[PDB]
Symmetry: C2
Subunit: 349 residues, 2 copies
């Protein structure tokens, strides 16, 4: 099914006749336009149109699978007004600002604007082979850089300087760090929040490296924890439990498995190994045009995995004031199982 | 006048009794909380309260000048509901999403939510001496790194690699690049949009370096253009005109000068030197907790400069397919003139 033919039944069930697409990732998903922060798409009974300004004329002509109307706001949605006369027009309420909604309300007085909240969650969950290729390229770059920087992770090095080395190499390759890099050593390993600080890595520390590459618009995501010297027996048990949990959750991936059941599998396992109050609250997420997108792997999730989806699996266990471990891989759901896309070594500790 | 005593008359003129502050920069401005993406402030007849969650308990106690209520949304604004009973409550319509507004509407059924659009524009335009100090520190870091990277800008070097060197050094210093770095050589100098590409700098090129440092939450911003080898006579005339324009606009800065009149001064000057259809459409902007904030120096601006404001002055002239020049300095308005905060050399060409 085409992307448009995936989207239209969703709009029907949501009770709207049209959709103003404003989230850059969904503008790009639908049209192929790669400067999507400066584009908008109207999906309507008349078809679908990409709105962008004249700076982008040639680019949009080359990239867009949709016809273009070339102008600046407010001419864009004013031109669109006659198309949505008398229609229920959905909009992305978790993206659109109130001021932007007011602008549309003024332009479309004979339309009914309908807020869509969770409606388009996981719209992009299943990737095409072209999209998978782009994600593989991003993850391959991530793996290359991780492999290059790994030996520099040793006693005497600041967390921050490890992060700088990773960033430098991703950028030089024509990519970028996908999100604020995490390099968490020793007690900093217990904060899932923290990013690379000036703390100096020391003998005995575990070091958690949480990183992804953005390349050609697509993201990757993985997490590794490594030992510098010999860790405490406690931290070794924690590492071994998190790795056991990760590999077990990954091994249950297949079309039809419920995301919540994956989360439960990880929870139960960590609980069996004495870490059932120390663990992260979501097992993982979709990855694509955004680092964090549908599906969601939490206990309450109603998501069901299907072939073509790309997700993370990331159990974590944190011991406040002591240390913590996260291990994460990027997984493609296949027709009868899974394929791990993130190839960097997972070491013993 | 305190920040609260600056804000309350503005709210009065805007016809509201209260304000839900959601823009991170204004949350931080008002409270001093530095993880302001995860804080919200209610300004009300009862006073002002910072809302944030328990991860931030100690930090908020240490940083906030305002009392704290500790919880996650929606408990935060539900707890706030009784405070705004029967009140007109302003909200930042250019920040708040429609979904977030719906959440507030449900929580506050006995309140009237009032959209504020341009209302708080330039709220933070005048900086305190502490804020000025933070901006000086950011700009000093920018100048240091620029001075360090400048000699590497030569024939054979990719624009991208110059950008990487700048980023590396800012990060290692405990700061960050304030915005996507621009290193624009040769014809790339004619695109004000473009960022550092893989283009190799060559003899004869001008190179425009547009950069700032974010450090401790505060931003800096400057732009330099340099010659690699000997430029064409045309590009030299363009450079000399832009520098002439920049220094002239800067020399007119004082309390009471209209931002629009500064823009006109630059326009007229470029026009006199045959570049009056080649120039940028805004002369500059405020800088602070954001790279781009009030005031605005465009022809239509109603802004009037006052002591304590920090702005950029950046004339530009672009010759499509050939090249272009931008030169920009960061300026503090003083009681009887100005002080240039950006100290990197401006070279001859
Ligand atoms: Mn990760
Ligand atoms: Mn600049």
């Amino acid at each position: 099914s085409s992307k448009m033919d995936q989207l239209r039944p969703v709009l029907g069930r949501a009770g709207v006749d049209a959709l103003w697409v404003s989230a850059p990732a969904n503008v790009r998903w639908l049209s192929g336009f790669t400067s999507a922060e400066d584009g908008k798409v109207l999906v309507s009974p008349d078809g679908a149109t990409l709105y962008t300004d004249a700076r982008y004329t040639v680019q949009a002509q080359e990239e867009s699978s949709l016809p273009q109307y070339i102008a600046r706001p407010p001419a864009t949605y004013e031109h669109a007004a006659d198309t949505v006369r008398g229609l229920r027009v959905g909009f992305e309420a978790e993206s659109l600002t109130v001021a932007e909604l007011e602008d549309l309300r003024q332009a479309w007085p004979n339309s009914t604007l309908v807020a869509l909240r969770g409606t388009l969650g996981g719209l992009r969950a299943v990737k095409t082979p072209e999209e998978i290729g782009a994600i593989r390229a991003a993850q391959d770059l991530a793996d290359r850089v991780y492999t290059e920087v790994r030996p520099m992770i040793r006693a005497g090095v600041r967390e921050l300087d490890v992060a700088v080395e990773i960033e430098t190499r991703l950028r030089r390759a024509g990519g970028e760090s996908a999100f604020e890099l995490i390099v968490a050593s020793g007690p900093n390993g217990a904060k899932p929040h923290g990013h690379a600080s000036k703390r100096v890595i020391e003998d005995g520390d575990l070091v958690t490296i949480d990183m992804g590459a953005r390349l050609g618009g697509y993201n990757s995501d993985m997490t590794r924890t490594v030992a510098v010297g010999t860790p405490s027996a406690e931290m070794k048990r924690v590492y071994d439990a998190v790795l056991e949990a990760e590999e077990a959750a990954i091994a249950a991936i297949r079309p039809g498995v419920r995301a919540a059941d994956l989360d439960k599998l990880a929870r139960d396992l960590l609980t069996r190994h004495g870490l059932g109050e120390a663990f992260a609250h979501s097992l993982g997420h979709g990855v694509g045009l955004e680092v964090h997108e549908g599906p969601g792997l939490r206990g309450t999730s109603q998501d069901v995995l299907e072939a073509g989806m790309v997700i993370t699996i990331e159990p974590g266990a944190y011991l406040p004031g002591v240390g913590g471990v996260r291990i994460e891989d990027l997984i493609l759901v296949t027709e009868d199982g899974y394929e791990v896309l993130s190839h960097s070594a997972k070491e013993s500790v």
